[model samples]
Target: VASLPGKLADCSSKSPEECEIFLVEGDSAGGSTKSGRDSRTQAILPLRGKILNVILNNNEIRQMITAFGTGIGGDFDLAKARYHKIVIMTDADVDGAHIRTLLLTFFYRFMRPLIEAGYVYIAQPPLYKLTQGKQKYYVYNDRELDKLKSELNPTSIARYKGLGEMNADQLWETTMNPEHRALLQVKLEDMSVIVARALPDVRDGLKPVHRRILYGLNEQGMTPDKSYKKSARIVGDVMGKYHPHGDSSIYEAMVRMAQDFSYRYPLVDGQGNFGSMDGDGAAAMRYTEARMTKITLELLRDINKDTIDFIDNYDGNEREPSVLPARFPNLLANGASGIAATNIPPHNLTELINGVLSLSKNPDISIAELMEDIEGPDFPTAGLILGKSGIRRAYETGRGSIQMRSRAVIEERGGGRQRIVVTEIPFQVNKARMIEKIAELVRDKKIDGITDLRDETSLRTGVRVVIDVRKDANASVILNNLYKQTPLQTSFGVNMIALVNGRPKLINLKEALVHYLEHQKTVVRRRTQYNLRKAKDRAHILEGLRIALDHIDEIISTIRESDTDKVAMESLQQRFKLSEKQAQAILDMRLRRLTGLERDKIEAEYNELLNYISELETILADEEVLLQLVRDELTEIRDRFGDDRRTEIQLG
Candidate 1:
């Protein structure tokens, strides 16, 4: 009786063996099980993307569990699982193979009994199409393809990159029907479940968990000015409402965003013991406090204004944004690194803003021209870039490797004896561990120059790892040896690949910035429309008040004569020629507004709103005006959060 949006379609079943679940890879063309299913016996759970690296907990998570209809440890009525056969069906493509493997892999880790029950399976769909004298023969694998080719290799072989090449009824009979379909049962020994590192949403430059964590703080009103909540609460809220993962994992992501040495623009403002550059870890979630930085607002701004779509969380009761409406080019500005995916290096905020401003003015600017403002990657861990060639290539082609060397100045310490005072190490190098490695190298007689190795690092002095040299040793050659022998100088392979439109792809510097600019334009356009509608609503209500004030005694009489608000509301609409909206506002108006001064205030506000509506409409009218708003917001962000380039470049 109450069908609504966001409700998941499901099925009902009686017998376990008769029941089945179709785990179809929902991203591509094939969502066919929708019609082919035998009524009440099967449910098609099209995992339409958004599957994470992992999760388990809460009634929200239980929703996922309860769907199986199998009663567990008296989590009854949980006899919820309708199916014994969990079929992992996918397209013929390699991505389908990877996706289905991961999808199958997720459930393997999801529960012990789910896989242990020996109920998991894989459907081998059609791969090659071959015909022999009007008879069609489909190849499900290479072995079938190879054997078939040896026989009546009569017609030209047609390969299917998509599942669309086959007929629907034929596809059902050949791949999905339980009688003829060959579902290969995947065993525990069959896989080493490929672990995929969380890929940051290219728009916000945040992974799934990170977005939920940041979004949760924004939801809780944990802005920079607000008092810090316990990291425990931040993680708890994130898990309870959005992500149903471990607190340690959630807290770790939050801590990483707060650590200045990690993110170029630290999004989270953590209050107690986060972590350090020396490879130290954070305190437990219960011990720390957290909130969002001022810059984080730029990500969440215009969110409530319909700038981005909100998707239902693991449970339908709550919703989380698909992606943040980021004004700041976070993907390029902060960067991202992922396994089974992309690696983007952080760039300086000032330089990226300048480049974005320049790009907006001239979209067709070349890589070299763009590089004038955005010199290269400005790593959060301050270090020295030895050359421009690698940087130039990455900006041009979206992939290249750059070298980073520790920032050290040779110092005089009593005559010929010298000190190589390294105030900054290469990005991602552990200061304490590097010290340990250097000591080991010296002890092994691999690096002969150093007389002493000491970490003079402090919160006061930043990253000072001091290396003392012997009188006989030359500081220059010893430093050169340190570079060659240790991680003090390392190669950072720059693959500027990021999630573009939800799929991972390599993007050049301008492409990333262009993505940012386009999203900003979208965000601004949506926001301007939202504001215009809001102003017009206020103007409608104010005009109603203006009319009431003009005929105050008549209006008073109109309301007094009516027994109910509904009748009086209609009377105002009928006598004064007011619409339902304006008439309703009149009824809701405070009695204090009857005061002459307050009546004047309503009149003044009406005039103010009229002007505001006109301006909002004007912004909506002109494209340049909208672009101007985008540029101005970028400038405001730069002025507030910009800093000097942490990593310096040297022309070698």
Candidate 2:
């Protein structure tokens, strides 16, 4: 047993299962955690600044490795691990998030067994502290904050902008105590959900970051028709308000969303150098300008009409949607890939909508029938799927590999000889690198018959690789060799693994749609309930207004006689037998509302509220009605944004 570091706070428990370790952000937070934690089973490790590299043999990282007793690389041993739970505790702010990511990266790269063995965890801290008289409430998100605000009418609210602001006891109560705190377990067992949450939402098929970028751009009035804004400005707002990640990562994700060669349906309308199909990288964020594409509006459609849940951002200073009210079938339209080894290839919107529509009518449709509508993967880069067997296998069994071949054609020159012109490559294949590989092969004599190879690709011409053939060599044989040797042809492994019902599951085509449709159903049901509640509340207020208007002269006399607004509010509530909210609404009404025209307007509004409430009730009561609404919305999205497939599948 090597000695622990000078500042390392060790716990009393010798049993690994009973013990947990907290890697806190800094000394202040570390001190609070150490004081608040159960000394018998909890240990505190303070990390100052960033833990960059574990391989460099630095003092702090070395001590941490030794303390865990599970050495890195060749000397690694998981059985000797000192703690069962390696919890990352940081402030609910951007810098803390950055620090946490760095530490996790270090651990993941070095002592991966710790995570794989279900040892890594992230502590969930309250974002807002609300107090009313003797009562206190700790809220994690905007939904909770709003609920508590209405219920408690909190006299004071404090955003826990940093961990340093909370006392030791408060920290324990809100974040350290097992009974009171929330801990997110990080493990491979439920890794699918983690990846799902990190990737796009099943309902919207967009990760939170992607959705936030579009929302931010829209909020800035940067539409498809509007002038573009600096990419730096968009990134700044996203970081400062919604996504708290680094600028580079946000910018990279944004750039990928804009590149036509990457996304089948680009969400961003970029006006500057957003990179190309070749290996060239995008310019720095500051040099670029962007806006929301017309198709992107469909993802955020009806978002403000209580169509989705909104949660507090990292700092609780703003609220962001939990998921977009995606009308389009984006999951299948654009596809998703993640660290969990889930690879979902994009399909044509037109085909995907047909499949979804078919599934809506016949839930038990076979993979063969579904494939009749959705014909394999559609690469945005425009390649050719070599065969259908691999696609069928993947769609049926959730795992298979499909081969893609570059699109090439023979062109005859003035001489009797012919040249090979390459137009498109396999998905994810770098064009410049593939061309370089062919050149290298020609130099090594691994491939022959090419007199010269030139990348004649232009912004206007798209991808054009002109391969000049030797005078007497066979172009056909050379092209075949190039496919065999280089990335001209590649196999795409399809692992359709996703989080099904909060756990990892391998699903087929039908199962994938089932999961997505199920999520949409849940969202719609919840939104319906939210709308119903809101409508009923409005109706209640309107009823009070109707009664108050009937006795307008009496109500006016009562209000004029009262000493204060509070007294008048209480008098109105008593006289009308109305609730506080209803009475308050009446009290807040304007003098102009007493006019004959204004009275008629109020009556109209009351009748409209009644109709809306009844309509919402009917939709909720009938499952078929709700499902029809889903179908109708999906059809509208299909009509608006659906396009032809790019990748073509060839039969044997």
Candidate 3:
């Protein structure tokens, strides 16, 4: 009883089989729905917001209740659900989108299977009506209205702003009619995430400093204002109010970006100093500025133009369309990262850019090239590149391990003892209290390290974390120990994710590369074979012209006597010892012979054409040369036209 905190409107209709209910808004709509609904099969329970963001605080949210006699958050029970169809009908507006989002968030968090099983929908109301005399027309949007305007000679078109604007009859006609009503059923699939495909080892070794410093600048006791005066004031005022989890963490992230080839400056300047894809990094957030990458914004702008599907929000709008006007699949490009939700992790930015360019020309590089080009971890900490032969082989063969250590240098001291210096780390190292964790391990003798530790990241291009060891300490031993025992070493697993069936799906690298290669081969073969056939046809025609020129008198006499082309062709063939193909071409010759030039001039041109034909035939006859000619033609066509290379043979 306590668990079912709110009064639930249960249906008298037995079980889920005979019942359907709408958890709706306001009594007016609910009452109409209830009155029209079959009491034996359907029900309606109207609900209003619990009042503001009280439930947002989590603990307080758990105590909330609904009219249906169910507890909010932790106390809600699925067994108490009374209807087979729990339709949530809300007005088409901002508040409605929000209401839908809350309900979806709830379902996503709690009643997940309900969403996955395909049991949610939204009612779409017509936005306009075009009436000419008695005939009526309904349109959903401005685009539809404009299209209708072109089709119908109408002087009056009334725009419907909201669901309330539509009368009950209009609602039934536009939204309730089985055939005409547009009700999109909701079904949920996996959420798109930024870091879904991240190497576990890389993720585990991440640090707070690995994250952008500007993201934590507010806590760094600085205002994000671009204007110096206000920014300076906020920095001064908030110095004591904020505390970062650790020291030099933010700096480490910036240093890591410099070495990892991930950060770049903006292409254009709307925001101060945002890094972009062509290799740029923002100035220190304290001294400069930052913003999202340009391509990301472009992606968002274009997403609406693409197709849409469904995804689950943890709340009630169980099955929302996977995307809205939903176009671009940002999940693959942007990626995701969060421990709380299942998602695709963000792609390697540098890898994505380079991969796109590499594929632009060749499009046939192995997945290994992709992985190798974007090799190693781009850690938050700037660390030395450690040589691991095993790692290189693993990359080539599509399986292997990498051995990484803290980068170090050799030094000499006055005491006649040799020493080594360490700087930089793998991209996996995080900027948060992870350093403290390592420090704790060193202090507890769980790991052996230098006599002194200091962050000297600000002193160099890449943040070099310094470890001053005793004169006798061996850097290699410490490095090996770090690789063997610490998070300093990481492995990148090559589970490939490719766009398939309108979504990004994980696949094995070797298999995916093979499929791509096979598909490319089929395309190339089609293009080459088609050109070979066409070129051979032209070559045959030229060869016949050459033979016709060599026996000019016989051909002229046969044609001048008004003999049929077949008879003329035979005369030329017999006189010149031409093959059947050449004889046929001589008979088919339309433009060249009818012009009536001297046979000597014709002979010279024919000889030149014959020479050209011989070269082409030699090229096409030899398999190696044939391949080169086709490729050269392909390249020329690609430059002049587009990628018109056919992937299949089709006569029509």
Candidate 4:
């Protein structure tokens, strides 16, 4: 009720037994958990790594502590699975069971059991008491802060975002009590560790946070044409209203959305300091500003017309769309990464457009034929893909590895040796780090090829890392070693894991394309339905107005004779046979607006809307028409945002 930043009603720890309190210390109870898996009726849970990761961070201690309540419901929605008490309980097990890394024993003479007992004791570690000169609000290194105990004195994170059921203590109790070590073999990467907060959905291609950020920004109408809004403001609203995680993580995700180097066609158009390819940190959220890019605007297109489902938001007061009315194949277009370990290579809008068009023409087209138009990944960082062998394998199955190599130009001078100048780098490989590894190899005499090494990289000239060879050294051999030892070349693992219908599934390229196309079809159909409803509604109103216009004198006569405004409206409704809304509207209209409104203009407008009503109806009536609209819409997006592929594919 006090510290957590969300709805309070769902957080009532109703019964004492129901109040499953999770106490998180600096170190988690180490690898194994107290939670047991019932092999008869249970699957599993993953946590040690989660607690180990979140609690270790100092900047996010308070924010990360908020994750403890969810630690009970390990994989439950952070906003949901409320009514649980969370305590910081990091530890080091001596024999795995009765182990204590350290403890905050605050009981001097009072009720030592009170703090350990009911809510009356207040589990909140006297944070305020620690501030009043007991410690004097200074910093204490966590290692010795335990002496602060001598002198003094710290789940469910985004990780379990995909775990379906299995939220009860039936799993967590096994970790809490070591005596119950039952049959529990868990794989974090495949189920708990990876897919939870790391991956995206195949259709919309957004994780929980990105989806929230986009939806939150869309609600603010922060489109390309709109002026930029401070990113901090977005982070605040999105964090509090939607995701309810820490501001730092939310802001980091927001920064990634705006970065062009990170995204093929960046979703957010940023106006201020975002970040750099050299692994520089972004400016504070307040220093940056952002708005949705034009291409991504299509992601939210027709959303208001109810093309997608809206689930209860993090807080119950409002609801958010389950997914964007995603017209674009954002999952593959911009690609995704991290756990579930998705490394889908981003692609060219034009090539994607062609693939979809061919697929639309013949849904049964072979993957090889689809590959003709689609080709392979079109990385935003212009590098060279070593082989179609890896590319074809990934498109065929859902997993494969491709060698991504930076392009190096061998230059000959008047001297005896050639100098190698790197013009490109692999996707996501930091330029500064890549250069650092080379310096290490050189200074150690691991690969002796150069007299000098420097980076000539700049905005206009693009990426350029130069290494001059010793006059007698072989430049080719040096270049070869550079690839072997440094990030000049990297193996990109293509594990296309994404949420399909709310569950993680490994889908091949054609399945992904087909999924997006089907999603667009639904969006288009829903949009048509919305337009048809609006058209018919307007047409009805137009019919009412047209009746008044055709018999203008009678309309005027009724209002004039019926002196009172009430009777005038009544007479208008009864005599002219208008709807209560149409009659009220006509009466509300001033004489100048209605009298000056020409019969020709009204009649012409009514017919046009009536025609549109029919047109929209026919669009919904025919499947082919709706799909054609999908094709045409895709064509327009490709035409508008189409760009040349950056990474070149070489025959390997």
Candidate 5:
């Protein structure tokens, strides 16, 4: 009933039941189409656009709407629509695909009812209108293309990119008339189930949003947005030291996500936010470095987001918090877990989140709280959680910790001093495995530990790392030696891969924190939005109450004086703008939104709008400032409510 789509040629029968149309492009094709079309059964429509992408289009594809009785956009009226079968006949090439997609989107959005009724179709034209001495043949897929290529070994052939390339007679014989045309109706298999499985993966973890944002920024020569683009560009190009990957790649990925429909933004940065299930596939290896989104920079970066505060951001510009805010506590809800460069395996994701949740509830909660619960990193290569005190110390001071264990034993020589037998240094100590990557480094002596390396991993338990050195060998000296000389003591700095607000992103610790915070803010915003929306709904009702109560005499005189709930509700709807359902909700009210001084003042002036609404404007004034505001607010909120309260509110 809506206006005919631009990709379709709708009829003029005035009734949907009796009409057929031919959607053709090009003046030559249209002339042939109109002349050859069955006058009673079909109508003619014409159009043009970028040949390659003529199929999948945006709002502009509605040019074909002018041919129909009903117009497009807001003016579309399905009830008065006139068309039965709206068919598309086009050349078989890239341009045809573009046109199809454009029309699909149109029908998918506006003319869906017509589409659902099974009236939409595509008439596939032959790619090769082969003519060998008056004999003709058509080809479609690779099989046909190959068969035709073999059949007509006539040296060479001509390829058609558009309908205009073919004359009227060829167009009518090959595409215009239905009897000789091959039409394939689109059919989706297991649509709901497919959508269900795909949507969550796409919407929750797909990094399309990231790609879109990055691409958009680069095209605009900008950063996260116009405001942060300049600073980000400077930091990306000039400060490559901080982030190993170039800024251009990261920016490109961000923009791609924004433009594609396949990706979604994560609600929380999970898996360290380094392009996890939802983020863009790890950016091209060399060009990708971990970066956070504006949302991540704001929310999770606050100490209140994680169960506890750990350290500052990579740049040390701000405090680095845990995965999520203390409110929804995604850290615990999801968990903290990973395997990286160090043999000391990362802890369970849930354990980390849980610990944060526990500590959030009781800031005084002890290291022992997670003793039985969280066992530390589950490095791909297993190792031991050493020196119990180290774990406690790490959490207590927010600094260094010797909690991660290294395996070794002291050996006393025949007579003199002592030597240490190092077996199973840490996790991920496979040299030909970890350090082997930098062959140049090893060759140039930049990396040591090449002498004692071996694949000592066994079937029993798979951890083979060993080294021997003199005793009195200062642990710090040895540690630093390993840190600089070997790959053993290196940090696999976390590039979080988590869903921020249901979208996926690959961000640094700081960025992850920031995004988690943004999620909290969004949740808060949504809560606030919900509050505002609900308040408005309530406000509208109460406004009626105030008016009704003020003029009770008129209501009583015209209608029933009775305050019977049903009657009152019905009367309100008839005499006012309130819907029946809204009136019912109003009837249920305790009369507080209407009469109470504090509640009224707060609803109309403070809580719903004044305080909540104004805060967002100030916070969003700038990206950095927004993050700063979140950090400050999160800190204050954490002190007041603590991390355990993360579960108190429903974020989704």
Candidate 6:
């Protein structure tokens, strides 16, 4: 084992259970943590800025891999881990979040077992520091700060923008102290957190920014049928209203939504450059035009109907939905992958819908039965799955390695000469880089046979990379060499880690479907209850109005004789035995509402509400009815947006 770095501050405790490791960003924060942390149990490893992006062979990555004592890219023993808890300590701002994500990406791709064993954690430092006379308070979010103000009436408030801003004492109390500190345990056992920073929510399968972008576009009337608005406008609206993060990040998220090569169902319709599959970056937000796709509209459907909760944005200037009211199984349909080794590859809408439909009927369906519908991942970058064993293992155990091969065919030319026409590459493989790597290998004499190479990709031709072969070269041998030496063939490591019920667990296919179904059931029930309450309130008012209609002349006389609106309201309530709201509504009614036409309309509305109320009540009462409703809506969504599977799974 390599020796620990000289700058590393080691804790005195030798027991793994008592030992904690804090990977603090910046030396200033490191100093504060070192001073604040318990010398007996806490070890501090200060990172200068950001850690290395790529893993293996790099000095920084090697040090971390060694420090963790769990080998990377090979056999790892959890028993050899140095610390029981690996805590990421950073600022409470965007940069801090980015750095944390970078570190998580490293651990996720390499030292994933640490996260799997429940050793990884994120430090939840206070966002705001409240001071009133001698009393001091720290709050992590706006809701807590607002609540604190009502009772404590803080005389001064300062935002904790960075860890360096806080003193050792404050840092100890708010972030480092075991008794007073708050820590979010990193859990990859659910769909939302491949790494929480990179992936979307487990329930709706949407990141905060993605949800905000969709919401902002919908709010601006940028629907699929409407004229496309500049991407800059959408990004600005989301940043100002919902997300106060950087404009570039917001725009990138929007660009990804528009990229068909990334998502199976592109949520945003972009008119201009939104990047390509060949590792090209997108155009500036100002250069592109965007609007919400029809499928994305389903995500925001019934949002105004109080189906989901809304919370204050960064500055509390505007409200944003806590979660989108997703009508479809977006997590499975579009799929999600993050650096934390959680790669839920995209699937065909038809296949995912069928699997969900089956699971809905038989909640305890076996993996074998579920596989009948969802054959395997249907990557947006169409390729060929080498075998079914990997798919089966992943569905049954939540962990497996899928071998993917690029679709290529050797076409014979005159005089026994042939060329390899490549169609598709493995999922997430960079085509441009892969081509470069193949050329480099040929130049280095690692693989021989190809005479010429060219990328014939264009708007008209999709991913047509041609390789000219020498007449004397053996095509089959050359193809095998290409697969062996280059990214033409790659294995997708499936560590289906996700957050389950706010905790991490490696869940199989059935658990994922069950959890989602349960969540939808809760959302549906809550939505139904909200609708029921509103309908009942309306019904109560209408019933009072119907009675008032019977005594219309008396009501008019009562109102006209009263000296004030309040007096009239009071008289109506007492005389007609109506509630305060009903009396107020009656008094506010115009003289024209007393006509026969208006009376007839009011009766019609009352009868319609009665029937609506009955249906909503019945839905709330039965679980089977609610599940069927979920399936019914899912089936409708599938029929509308479902398409053919792109990736082909080969059965042995």
On TM-score, the leading prediction is 6
Off by over 4 Å in 3: 1-66, 70-260, 263-406, 416-420, 428-437, 440-449, 458-463, 471-476, 500-652
Off by over 4 Å in 5: 1-418, 421-530, 542-570, 574-582, 586-628, 634-652
**What number of backbone clashes does candidate 3 have, counting pairs of residues 3 or more apart or in separate chains?**
63
Better of 1 and 3 by lDDT: 1
Question: How do these models rank on TM-score, best leading?
Answer: 6, 2, 1, 4, 3, 5
Global lDDT of model 6: 0.82
Off by over 4 Å in 1: 1-197, 338-340
| Candidate 6 wrong stretches, greater than 4 Å | 1-196, 591-596
lDDT of each: 0.79, 0.80, 0.45, 0.69, 0.44, 0.82
lDDT of 3 by residue, 1-652 (tens): 3223232344456766445556555533554554444556555555554442323534323432232233435655545544545566765655555566776666566566555554555567777777777878887778877686777554545655445555666655676554576666677532232232221111111212222132223223233233233222222322222212232333334333333223221111122443432224554445543322333232222222222233442222233222222011123223322333222222333443344334434656775676654443333233444443433444355344444345556566667554444455543455333355557778899876467665555434454455556665776676566567655554433333444433444543333333333333333344444445555666666666765765566676666774676776666667767778877777677645645565555566556655665665565456556444434533443343221211111121
Best model number under lDDT:
6
TM-scores, one per candidate: 0.72, 0.73, 0.38, 0.70, 0.27, 0.74
lDDT of 1: 0.79
Give lDDT tens digits, candidate 4, residues 474-561.
8988898889889999988988888888778899989989998999998889888888888777777778777877777898899999
What are the per-residue Cα lDDT tens digits for candidate 2 across 52-138? 422456777776777777887787777776787888888665567667777777777778888878788998888887766678778
lDDT, candidate 3, residue 86? 59
| Clash counts for all predictions | 7, 3, 63, 20, 111, 6
Model 4 / residue 628 / CA error / Å: 1.8
Per residue, candidate 6 scores C-alpha lDDT tens digits across 115-177 of 888899998888877776678777899999879888854346677778888888988888878
- Which 10 successive residues of model 2 have the least lDDT summed? 188-197
What's model 6's TM-score? 0.74
For all the candidates, what are their Cα RMSDs to the real structure? 14.6, 8.6, 18.2, 14.9, 24.0, 10.4
* Model 4 TM-score relative to the real fold: 0.70
* Candidate 1 TM-score over all chains jointly: 0.72
